Amino acid sequence: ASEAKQTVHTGNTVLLMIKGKPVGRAQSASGQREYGTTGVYEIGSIMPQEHVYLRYEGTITVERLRMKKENFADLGYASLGEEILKKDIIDILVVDNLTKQVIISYHGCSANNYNETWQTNEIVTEEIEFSYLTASDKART
Amino acid sequence: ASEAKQTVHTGNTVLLMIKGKPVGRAQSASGQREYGTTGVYEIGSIMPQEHVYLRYEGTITVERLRMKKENFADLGYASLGEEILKKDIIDILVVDNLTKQVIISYHGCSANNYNETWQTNEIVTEEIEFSYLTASDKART
Amino acid sequence: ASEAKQTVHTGNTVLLMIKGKPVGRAQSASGQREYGTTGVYEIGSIMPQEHVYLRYEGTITVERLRMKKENFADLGYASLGEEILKKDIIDILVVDNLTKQVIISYHGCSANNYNETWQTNEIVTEEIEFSYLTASDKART
Amino acid sequence: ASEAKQTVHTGNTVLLMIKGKPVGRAQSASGQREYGTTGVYEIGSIMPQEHVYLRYEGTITVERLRMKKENFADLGYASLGEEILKKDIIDILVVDNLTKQVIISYHGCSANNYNETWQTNEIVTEEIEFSYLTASDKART
Amino acid sequence: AITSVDSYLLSEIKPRLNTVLENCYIIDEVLKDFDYQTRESFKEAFCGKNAQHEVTVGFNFPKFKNNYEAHYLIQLGQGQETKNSLGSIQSSYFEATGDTLVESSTAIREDDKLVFTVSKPIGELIKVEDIEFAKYDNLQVEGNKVSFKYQTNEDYENYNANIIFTEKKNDSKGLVKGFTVEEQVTVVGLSFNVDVARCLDAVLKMILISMRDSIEEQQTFQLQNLSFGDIAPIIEDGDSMIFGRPTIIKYTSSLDLDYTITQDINKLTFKERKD
Amino acid sequence: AITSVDSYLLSEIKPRLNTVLENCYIIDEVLKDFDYQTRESFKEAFCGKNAQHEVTVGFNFPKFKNNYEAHYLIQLGQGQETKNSLGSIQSSYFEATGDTLVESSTAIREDDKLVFTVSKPIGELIKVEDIEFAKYDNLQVEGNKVSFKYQTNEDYENYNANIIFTEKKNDSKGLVKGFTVEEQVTVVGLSFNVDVARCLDAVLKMILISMRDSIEEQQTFQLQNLSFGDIAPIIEDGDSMIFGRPTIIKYTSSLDLDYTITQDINKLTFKERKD
Amino acid sequence: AITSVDSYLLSEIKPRLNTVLENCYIIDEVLKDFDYQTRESFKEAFCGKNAQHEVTVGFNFPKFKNNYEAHYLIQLGQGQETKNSLGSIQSSYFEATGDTLVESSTAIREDDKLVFTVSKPIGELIKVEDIEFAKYDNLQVEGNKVSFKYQTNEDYENYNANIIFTEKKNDSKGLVKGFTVEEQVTVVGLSFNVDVARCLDAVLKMILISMRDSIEEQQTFQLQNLSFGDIAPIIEDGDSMIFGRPTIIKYTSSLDLDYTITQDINKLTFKERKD
Amino acid sequence: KREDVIVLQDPYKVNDGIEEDLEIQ
C-alpha cells in the first residue's frame, strides 16, 4: 500500500540536473537564503513596531565524488583560472525521480569557491558553492 | 493512575499549528527572547545600582521534514524570491494535544532565513527562522 | 556512620526556592561573578605592581522542565512582552534540604534572556538567565 | 625499589595550601604566564633581529567540590559583593606531600572571577581564577 | 504515585481490543496492506460481534493452560532511572489531588447561575469543552459543581458539555518527592499459525498508536518507543511449533511520593530590641 | 496505513523475477563478470521461457517440503522506531485517500473538452505524462475523468497518455497519527550447488536495484540498505549440504492511522456585551 | 570512616518497613495504581498491626531455610573508584568528630541563660530548629549543653526544641585522607506468588524514596540511582517456582581515614645573624 | 516431588466412630 498523503522526499527520490545532464555520484547539497529582516524601534517602545525585508542573499553548495570523466572542471561548469571570465550563468534543477517534475530550481547560478580534497584512505571528493540570483518553485502539477 | 500535579509537556502532547492547519512531520522548534538588560554604574560604586530593560529581540526556529505536498514553499508561508514582499504576517501557535488549549502563541511572525538540505542517506529536512513582534500566553483556563 | 567533617553538597541536598515556593523539576543552575581585576604597569617594570577591583558583573542561569502548571511564564516570574516592564525584582534562594538553612541567596535578580525548546523525542525544557545586583551568604548557623 | 632519579609528580604527591590550611577536596589547578615577547623587524630583513620581553601576565585557576563547611566563601578567601574590597592579598602554595617542601608558590594572589555550578546528577563544583603579582620556586633543598 | 505499567497496559488493551475486533470496517482499514487470503481468514476467525473464536491477554507464567490459537502475552522487563531534579523535587501542591477524570455533564439551570454537576468534588478544573469563560461569566467552582452567570448565557440552558477535571482528596498541603524512570515492557503475540501472529502484531501496533490520545499516558507515560523482534519458534517440543514476534515498549514515568507539611504560619511577632 | 514488508517483497519479487529469468539478454547482462561455466550452466538450467527447472520463493517454516535446488527464503527480522513528529502528527488530509495508482488512458473527445477516463474516481491528480496544463487549458477533474479545453488542443484527439493519480475513498477529513519505523528483513537463497547460490544472489541484487524505481517503495519504503553474510552450510545432516548466503534488507516506513474529525464550522455568532 | 552499605540498608529498611506495613492508609497510598484484587490480598496478608503473615529481610547465603512467601534479599555487588582529590585530601579537622546526631531537648532555665541539655558532648552545632541566634543572644556551647541569654528571651522558658549536632571524641587534630567510591548493591524480593513480588517491589521503591531525607545518606551516601531487572523464575527445581525482580541501587560515599598530627607550634625564635 | 517451598497442613479427613482394637463377643 502507498498513501501519498504522508510521503516525504529522500535521497532515492531526487535527481540533481544541470543543462539536462544528471550529475553523477552527487552526494549532498544545501541551500541558504537570507532576507535580512530588520526591526524598527521607536523612542517610546522597547518592542519592534514592525519588521522589513532589506536584502536577499542566497547560496547553494554541492558535494560530489570526482569521477574520472565529466568532473565539474571537465564539464566546463567550474573553472580553474581566467577561463572563469568566459563562463556564463547556469541553472541548477532538483527534479523528482518518480514524475520528473520539478521541486526547486535556482536561476542565474554563479560559482563562489571551489574545493577538492585528495586523501589516501577515502574516495576523492570535491565541493562547489554557488551564488544565485533567484530561486523558483514553479512548474508544479 | 494520573496525578496532574506533576505532569510535564513532551513531543507527544504538543501540536504546532499555523492558520488552523497542523504542520505535518514537524520535528523541533526553539524560541529565544532578549530583553537587553543593562546595569547602571555610578562613580562611587563598582556594583550595579540597578538594571533596566532596553530592547526586545525574539526569534523562533522550526525544523521540518519536507513532505512532497504542503511544504512551507507550497503553503505560501515561506518564499523564494520577490514573492516574499507580498507575504503578510502570520501567527504560530503551540497548542495542547489533550485539551486543544493554547500554551504559547507568537504574534506578527516574519521570516528571517530559510535553509533546506538535500542529502543522500537521510530524509530531506528544512529549517526556517522567524522574527516576531510579540509573544503571548493568554487564553488559559 | 556519618562524619559531617567531610560532607559535600549534591543535587539531593539542595532546594531552589523563589518567594518561598520551591520551583519544581528544576535541573541545573550556574552562577558567575566578575570583579574585573586589572593590573597597574609602571614604566620601569614589566611586572604588575598591583591589582585593583573595578566592576562587578554577575549572572545566574536556571534550567527547568516545563511543567504543565506553574511554569515560569504562568508564575509571573518571567515575561513574554511588555508585561516585563511591570515585573519587579526577585530574590532566588538556594537552601539546604536537611536543615532548611541558606547556602547562598541572590538579591535584586532581574531577567536577561529567555529560552524554550520544543523537541519531539525529549521532554520540553526552558532556560532563564538572570542578572542580579548583589549576592549574599548570610544567615549561617 | 625506588630510584628517585626518574620520579614525577602526580595528584597523590601534591598538596594545595592556603594560609597553612590545606584546602579540602580540591580537584585541579592550572597556571598560566605570558611574557609578551615581541620581535624587532628592520627594513632590510624579514627575519626578527631579536626578541624582547614587555609584559608579565599570569593567572591561576582552582577547581573544588563545595564542602558543606570551609567553602571558599565561608573561609573568607573569596567574596560575593562589596566585601571583596576589604579582602587582602593571599599566597597560594603547592607543597610536596612527601617532604612538605615547596614546589611553587604564587605571591600576591588576587581574585578575578568566581564560578559555581549547581547540578542534579553530579556533585557541586566551584571554580576560582586568581591573578597574581609574582611566582616563586624558592626554598628548595 | 507509583506506576504499574502492566496493569495499565492490560486495562487499556482489553476493552480497546474488543472494540476494534467488534467491527469489520476498522479491521479492513488496519489490514489494508495484507493479502486477501490472510486478511479474510483472520476476519472470519476473530472479527465480528458473533465471532466464535476469541483472543485473550494475560501475564506470563500462568499455572493454568493458556490458549495458543491467539493470545497477547505480557512480561514486565527492565527499568532504569534517567533524570532527577534538585532535592528530588517534582512539584508542589496545596490541595491533595488524585487521578484526572473526564465526565460528561449536561448544563442545568440555577436561580442565578448555569451549572454542571459532577460525580465527585473538584480539586482543580482543567478544561470545559468548547468554552472560554470571560470575567463577565465569573467562573466559580464550589465543591461538586461548577457555575457561571445565568442571564447573558440563557440560550445554553441545556448545553450537552463534557468536563476534564481533577479529584479532591484533602485540604492538606505537601511536597512531591520522586524521580523519572525509563521502563521497558515486553509484549508478544502467540499463535501456532504464523499469519495469525502477523495480523495480531499489526493490530497490536494500531492499538498502541491509538493509545497515545489517552489521558493517562498523556499525563503519566509520555515518550513511547517501540521495538520489534524477529519471528521465532517459541516452542519446538510440541506436536507443532508456537510462533511469536516479541515487541518491546518503552515508557517514561515519574515515581513520586507526597510529603505532607504541618507548618502553617498565621501570626507575626515583629518587635524591636533595646540595649 | 500499516506496512507488511514481507508481502510487498513477495509481490515485487515474483513477477519481476519471472520476467528477468524469461529472457537471456538480461541474464547475460547481469552475469557479465562471472565465468563462462557457471554462467552457461545457470542459463541452461533456469533461464529461458522453456526452462525445465524453476526457482521458487516463500516464507520460512513451511510445513511442506521445499525445493532446495534454487529457492528464495524470506524471514521478517527485527524492527525499530527511529524518528517522531510533534504529537505523532505526520500529515493532514481533507479527503480520504487510498493507494497511488498508475493507469494508461487514451484521450477521448467530448463536445467541449478532451478527456481521459480512469478505472476509479480521483482524490488527487499528481501527474499526466509529458503535459504541463496552462490556465487556457483549464484542467478540471470531475470524479472518474479529467478534462481540458477541446479547441486549441484538437491536434491531440487520440493522445496515448498515461496517468499517475490517487484513489478517492470518502469526503471526510481527519488527521494522520503515526511514526517512522526502521525495519530489517532477511533474504537468503538456498541451493545444494554453491555456484547456483552465487548466481541467485547476483540476480537478487539486480532485482533489488530495479525495485528502487517502483512507485510503492518510492512513496512508502525509502532508504533501502543492503548487507550480505558469508556463504555458510545451512545444513550438514543431509546426504549433501545446503549452501546459502543470507542478505539483510533495511527499509524506512511510516506506520500511521487516520483519525477522523466530525467538527465542521459553518456559522458565526459575533455579538457584543453590555454592562 | 569506612562505609558498610549493607548494614546501613538493613538498619534503614527494617524499622521503616515495619512502620509502613503497620498502617493501611500509607499502603493504600502506595498501591493506588494497582488493581483491587492484588491490593486487597496483599493488605489482608501483610498489612495491619495484627497481620498473621510477616515479611523478612536478610543477607544472601544463609545456612538456614529462609521464608519464601515474602522476603527482601540483599547482596553486596560491585564497586568502583570514581574521583580523587589532591594528595587524597578530603577535609581538615581540629577536633575529632564522630557521627552526626539529632536529639530533641526541651529548654531549661539557668540563672543567666536558657539552655538545652544533650546526651553527649558537642564538637560542633549545626542547627537549632526554627532559631537564628543573634549577637545579643550570644550563643555559646560548653560541653554537653548550649546556652543563650535569659532576659530578652524569657517568653520561651520551655521551648520544645530539637537539635542537630555532632559528637565530640578528642581534642586532637589531624587530616582526612581518602577518596570517593561508586558502589552498586543488589536488592531482590522473593515470593512464589508473582503479584506479592510486584507489590513488594513497589513498597521497596517507596521506602527508597523516603530514605532520601535521612541524615546519614544525606551526609554520606549521596547520588542514589536505581535500576530494575526483569521478573524471572529464580528457581525451577522446586514444586513451584520462586519469582523475583532484582533491583540495583547505586551510592557514592567517601572512604577516608583520620591521620593525626602531633606538631603544635607555641613559640618563636626570631634572631638575626652577624658576619 | 516433595513439598518444601509451599507447605499446607494435613487434609481434614472425616473420622469414623468405630473404636480401634475393639473387643467383640
Closest-CA distance of chain E to residue D76, Å: 27
Residues G81/G82/G85/G89 CA torsion (nearest 10 deg): -40
β F222-228/F247-261 pair status: antiparallel
d(CA F245, CA F229): 6
Q: What is the DSSP letter of E226?
A: E
Taking alpha carbons only, the member of C18, C102, C119, C118 closest to residue C60 is C18
Q: What's at E1, amino acid-wise?
A: A
Structure-block grid coordinates of residue F223: 532508504
Residue with cell 652577624: G274
Please give the backbone phi and psi of residue E221, each rounded to the nearest 5 degrees, phi first. Answer: -125, 50
Spell out which residues of chain G touch residue H4, defining contact as CB-CB under 8 Å.
Answer: 238-239
The answer to whether G242 and G234 are in contact (CB under 8 A) is yes
**C41 closest CB neighbour out of D55, D115, D119:** D55
Q: Do B118 and A41 touch (CB under 8 A)?
A: no
Q: Do D26 and G86 touch (CB under 8 A)?
A: yes
Residue with cell 570517593: G180
Spell out which residues of chain B touch residue A136, defining contact as CB-CB under 8 Å.
Answer: 80-81
d(CA D9, CA C14): 36
Q: What's at E142, amino acid-wise?
A: E
Stated as kind and residue range, the H or E segment containing G273 is: none
Taking alpha carbons only, the member of C9, C20, C109, C121 closest to residue C60 is C109
β F56-59/F71-75 pair status: parallel
Is C6 at the interface with chain B, CB within 8 A? no
Cβ-in-10-Å burial (0-12, 13-18, 19+) of B42 comes to exposed
Closest-CA distance of chain A to residue B58, Å: 10
Contacts of B108 (CB under 8 A, 6+ apart): A50, A51, B89, B91, B132, B133, B134
Spell out which residues of chain B touch residue A104, defining contact as CB-CB under 8 Å.
Answer: 73, 80, 116
Query: Would you say the C-alpha torsion E13, E19, E24, E28 has a positive or negative sign?
Result: negative
d(CA E127, CA E157): 19
Number of H helices, E strands in chain B: 0, 10
**E218 closest CB neighbour out of B3, B6, B13:** B13
Contacts of G184 (CB under 8 A, 6+ apart): G77, G78, G79, G248, G249, G250
Is A44 at the interface with chain C, CB within 8 A? no
Q: What's at F242, amino acid-wise?
A: I
Would you call F154 helix, strand, or coil by DSSP? Answer: helix
Is C54 at the interface with chain B, CB within 8 A? yes
d(CA E145, CA E147): 7
Please give the residue of chain A at the shortest CA–CA distance from C84. A46
The answer to whether G63 and G47 are in contact (CB under 8 A) is no
Would you call F19 helix, strand, or coil by DSSP? Answer: helix
Structure-block grid coordinates of residue E84: 532527577
Buried b / exposed e across E138-170, counting CB within 10 Å, b at 16+?
ebebeeebbbbbbeebeeeeebebebbbbbbee
Q: What's the alpha-carbon Rg for chain F, to the nearest Å?
A: 26
The answer to whether A131 and A58 are in contact (CB under 8 A) is yes
Q: Do C1 and G216 touch (CB under 8 A)?
A: yes
Q: Name the method of structure determination.
A: cryo-EM
Structure-block grid coordinates of residue F156: 491531440
Stated as kind and residue range, the H or E segment containing E207 is: helix E194-211
Residue with cell 555520484: A25
Buried b / exposed e across B100-120, counting CB within 10 Å, b at 16+?
eebbbbbebbbbbbbbbbbbe
Number of residues that make up chain D:
141
The CA distances from residue G233 to G197, G240, G245, in Å, are: 12, 10, 9
To one decimal, the resolution in angstroms is 4.3
**How many Cβ atoms sit within 10 Å of the Cβ of residue G260?**
10
Would you call G126 helix, strand, or coil by DSSP? Answer: strand
Taking alpha carbons only, the member of G148, G140, G144 closest to residue G110 is G148
Buried b / exposed e across B50-89, counting CB within 10 Å, b at 16+?
ebebeebbbbbbbbbbbbbbbbbbeeebbbbeeebeeeee
Please give the backbone phi and psi of residue A36, each rounded to the nearest 5 degrees, phi first. Answer: 60, 40
d(CA G214, CA F102): 71
Give the HSE-up count for residue G139: Cα atoms under 13 Å, Cβ half-sphere.
12
Is F271 at the interface with chain E, CB within 8 A? no
d(CA C41, CA C47): 7
Buried b / exposed e across G160-188, counting CB within 10 Å, b at 16+?
ebebbbbbbeeeebbbbbbebbbbbbbbb
Is B43 at the interface with chain D, CB within 8 A? no
CB-based touch H/A (3+ pairs, under 8 A): no
Structure-block grid coordinates of residue D82: 562589596
Question: CA angle B124-B125-B131, nearest 5°?
Answer: 155
d(CA C11, CA E232): 46
The answer to whether A82 and A116 are in contact (CB under 8 A) is no
Please give the backbone phi and psi of residue F21, each rounded to the nearest 5 degrees, phi first. Answer: -75, -10
The answer to whether F32 and F16 are in contact (CB under 8 A) is no
Q: Do F86 and B123 touch (CB under 8 A)?
A: no
Query: Would you say the C-alpha torsion F93, F97, F102, F108 has a positive or negative sign?
Result: negative
Structure-block grid coordinates of residue G135: 549577637
Stated as kind and residue range, the H or E segment containing G206 is: helix G194-211
Is C122 at the interface with chain A, CB within 8 A? no
Q: What's the alpha-carbon Rg for chain C, to the nearest Å?
A: 19
d(CA F10, CA E35): 11
d(CA E112, CA C62): 47
Q: Do E213 and B97 touch (CB under 8 A)?
A: yes
Is G99 at the interface with chain C, CB within 8 A? yes
d(CA B73, CA E221): 36
The CA distances from residue E88 to C65, E178, F237, G219, in Å, are: 13, 5, 61, 16
φ/ψ bin of B108: left (φ > 0), alpha (ψ from -120 to 50), beta (otherwise): left
Q: What is the DSSP letter of E265?
A: -
CB-based touch E/B (3+ pairs, under 8 A): yes
The answer to whether F21 and F30 are in contact (CB under 8 A) is no
Closest-CA distance of chain B to residue E257, Å: 11
Structure-block grid coordinates of residue G187: 536488592
The CA distances from residue A105 to A17, A34, A56, E247, in Å, are: 10, 17, 16, 45
Is C110 at the interface with chain B, CB within 8 A? yes
Would you call F270 helix, strand, or coil by DSSP? Answer: coil
Spell out which residues of chain E touch residue F86, defining contact as CB-CB under 8 Å.
Answer: none
CB-based touch F/B (3+ pairs, under 8 A): yes
Stated as kind and residue range, the H or E segment containing E60 is: none
d(CA E158, CA E114): 9
The CA distances from residue B39 to B49, C56, D11, in Å, are: 7, 10, 43
β F173-191/F247-261 pair status: antiparallel
Would you call F41 helix, strand, or coil by DSSP? Answer: helix
Taking alpha carbons only, the member of E226, C68, F83 closest to residue B63 is F83
